[PDB]
Scaffold this active site. Structure first.
Site, mmCIF file in Angstrom:
data_model
loop_
_atom_site.group_PDB
_atom_site.id
_atom_site.type_symbol
_atom_site.label_atom_id
_atom_site.label_comp_id
_atom_site.label_asym_id
_atom_site.label_seq_id
_atom_site.Cartn_x
_atom_site.Cartn_y
_atom_site.Cartn_z
ATOM 1 N N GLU A 148 61.921 72.268 85.533
ATOM 2 C CA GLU A 148 63.558 72.367 85.266
ATOM 3 C C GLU A 148 63.683 72.114 83.966
ATOM 4 O OE1 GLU A 148 66.312 69.748 86.821
ATOM 5 O OE2 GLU A 148 64.862 68.954 88.101
ATOM 6 N N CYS A 189 63.951 69.465 91.160
ATOM 7 C CA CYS A 189 62.666 68.723 91.250
ATOM 8 C C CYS A 189 61.668 69.162 92.531
ATOM 9 C CB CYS A 189 62.926 67.204 91.769
ATOM 10 S SG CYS A 189 64.974 66.692 91.091
ATOM 11 N N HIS A 245 59.823 61.583 96.968
ATOM 12 C CA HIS A 245 60.223 62.005 95.564
ATOM 13 C C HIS A 245 61.370 61.142 95.217
ATOM 14 C CE1 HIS A 245 62.670 63.803 92.439
ATOM 15 N NE2 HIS A 245 63.779 63.433 93.179
#
Ligand code: COA
Lengths: 383, 383
Positions: free
Chosen positions: A79, A111, A233
């Site tokens: 990104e 992400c 994450h």
């Protein structure tokens, strides 16, 4: 015939700043970063290093001549793109000397990009078990000096070689994904820094984990007791713990202790790097692989991928017998330990510097694959 | 166990300009445009319509309530993104009312993005035959007023529903892909218009087709005589013809005339729209399906996909029995025939208008899914 991660490695720039030093510079208690968000060292990079620089270094660490001939697809999840049209994967394909008859492209979804790449790669190899796929997460997480998210910054990449009969992690077919149109974090075309709603982001992340976890448990019957470890994450180490705590309160005390201990092991590297966006989850996986001593062949690893916007997915991987012989712990520890510590002053100077692509110029940087020049907006890399 | 395109459709904005008028305004022979480049009408859109607008309208034309429940992956191929982080597929997922447990993301690789999505979708359905994938190519090809590429401009989207036992095109496993790091066309972050090298783009396109075609022939033994029709990525109609002419000169004359005749049928729609970047190849496919009278079930269609940067791929598809009953000719012809013709003055005004996402505002556009407002950079759509 199993399919999954055969080799995996991460790369971070050769610079960092200590969180105690940053706290003092920001006139706050030198510990709200160590305990509040849970970060100790932040990865920082000069304008001469971009996602290609990181992707190339991480991939170089795991590719042999044979891999380069067998890979017929190169994917970069990011990104932090440098072109609106040309996929960063095309340049990576050249730098890595991968065979010509391959498709290369970039995947974008905050992400979550690299996870999409990993799953698509898995399917590809499942259908063409003689081929391999290079999937690389690469990002530069910069929020701004004196910004709210500044403490969670990071930069780097995680490279993964997907193949049949993987030597590290065999991926299962129990994927549970979710898509919700939510503006917790985003970056309009033209914005160098992201638009971010902290409260909404924490909430969406925590709720998205709860949602995919509950749905996954419905479909598989698998619960926390069935997982030897969980890779998350994470924007920062305490968010992940928050998401986990919100869902394990009904587990036995011993089980909660076990789960939280595995989580702590998964964030060892992250506390010294910061947010890698697409690569955060995978840095967590690497941390578990190289730092979690109780894991052994046959163990089940749960992975929760998140992407603001927002998209999430939960899937499982099984540790392959002998995986310990195919890690990069020595390389990774040296990479982290050999970094140069920057003063806050050096950091702000390096952080604020802008690369104007509209100006023809040359750049000096000893790092392999760093930007060496810009000509008619085109970047050249020193390989 | 067949896998491919079940339904397909395109959408273009409700405005266009006559290429003769553009030629006169640019003091160029009209023949340069109509014959030299091969374009008759250029699709033009106001700032109130973006890739979401086009993707939503295209997808809405082919999605049933059943499809929305079976789709667990939404992919948007584009190089005209509106966010550097949040995938446009996320908003599309919401607008189309697709079931929540799906993964959504954007693929970027110039004019090749949608093709990557189609191939990955194919593998997905191959492994999960009960699921479907929505793949949408969406782009706005604007080069600039008085620019070299201006005559090739276009805008729109092509939506495809991928599933097993497809009712239109069954895809074969004969894919030949190629990646080369070439700067023929690109768009640095921050550049509203693309950087382009006319000559290099034409030559790379032609040479890329030659390379994948030769390799494909080497691997399958299939030649031009074995193909009932060929769909090419179409930046402008004479592009595919040039590539074709450079490779068929050794074929019999009857064969050459048959090939070129089928090519002419594949560009009928494109001559009225212009470059759709990721959607050009697939607009060509639609044109073949809906405009070629002599094609039948069982016929083999060759497809050549190209994306600057550059990535290319050749693959085959077979016409499914009964495909003629699942097209959208009436809808498409009405969409093209009912557009409002703009004068060159109106065109330049519409073309030059900018959207400052940084400004809160409301926009007025009768088109469904057009942008209705901007709040804190966030876009709302009329529905
Ligand atoms: C397509 C593009 C290169 C054409 O640029 P251009 O400078 O206008 O084209 P040229 O001036 O060289 O000449 C135009 C063509 O029309 C012909 N021509 C010129 N005037 C003509 C007329 N009045 N009547 C008939 N033919 C005419 C020329 O002979 C030439 O044909 P040829 O190239 O097939 O031999 C340009 O619009 C562009 O930059 N496009 C963007 C990149 C792109 O789309 N690339 C494709 C690869 S994906």
């Amino acid at each position: 015939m199993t399919i999954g991660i055969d080799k995996i490695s991460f790369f971070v720039p050769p610079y960092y700043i200590d969180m105690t030093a940053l706290a003092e510079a920001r006139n706050v208690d030198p510990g709200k970063f160590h305990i509040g968000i849970g970060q100790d060292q932040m990865a920082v990079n000069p304008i001469s290093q971009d996602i290609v620089t990181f992707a190339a270094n991480a991939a170089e660490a795991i590719l042999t001549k044979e891999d380069k001939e067998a890979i017929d697809m190169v994917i970069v999840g990011t990104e932090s793109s440098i072109d609106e049209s040309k996929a960063a994967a095309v340049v990576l394909h050249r730098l890595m000397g991968i065979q010509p008859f391959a498709r290369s492209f970039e995947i974008k979804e905050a992400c979550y990009g690299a996870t999409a790449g990993l799953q698509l790669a898995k399917n590809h190899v499942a259908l063409h078990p003689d081929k391999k796929v290079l999937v690389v997460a690469a990002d530069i997480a910069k929020y701004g000096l004196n910004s709210g998210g500044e403490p969670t910054q990071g930069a780097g990449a995680v490279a993964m070689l997907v193949a049949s009969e993987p030597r590290i992690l065999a991926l299962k077919e129990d994927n549970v994904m979710l898509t919700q149109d939510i503006y917790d974090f985003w970056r309009p075309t033209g914005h160098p820094y992201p638009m971010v709603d902290g409260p909404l982001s924490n909430e969406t992340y925590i709720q998205s984990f709860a949602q995919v976890w509950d749905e996954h448990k419905k479909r598989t019957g698998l619960d926390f007791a069935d997982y030897d470890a969980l890779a998350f994450h994470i924007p920062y180490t305490k968010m992940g713990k928050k998401a986990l705590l919100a869902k394990i309160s009904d587990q036995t005390e011993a089980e909660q202790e076990r789960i939280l201990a595995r989580y702590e092991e998964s964030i060892i590297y992250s506390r010294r790097v910061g947010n890698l966006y697409t690569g955060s989850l995978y840095l967590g996986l690497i941390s578990l692989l190289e730092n979690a001593t109780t894991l052994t062949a046959g163990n089940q690893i749960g992975l929760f991928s998140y992407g603001s916007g927002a998209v999430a997915e939960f899937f499982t991987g099984e540790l392959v017998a002998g995986y310990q012989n195919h890690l990069q712990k020595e390389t990774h520890l040296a990479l982290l330990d050999n970094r140069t510590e920057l003063s806050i002053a050096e950091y702000e100077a390096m952080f604020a510097e802008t690369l104007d692509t509209d100006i023809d110029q040359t750049l000096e940087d000893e790092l392999k694959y760093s930007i060496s020049a810009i000509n008619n907006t085109v970047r050249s890399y020193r390989n």
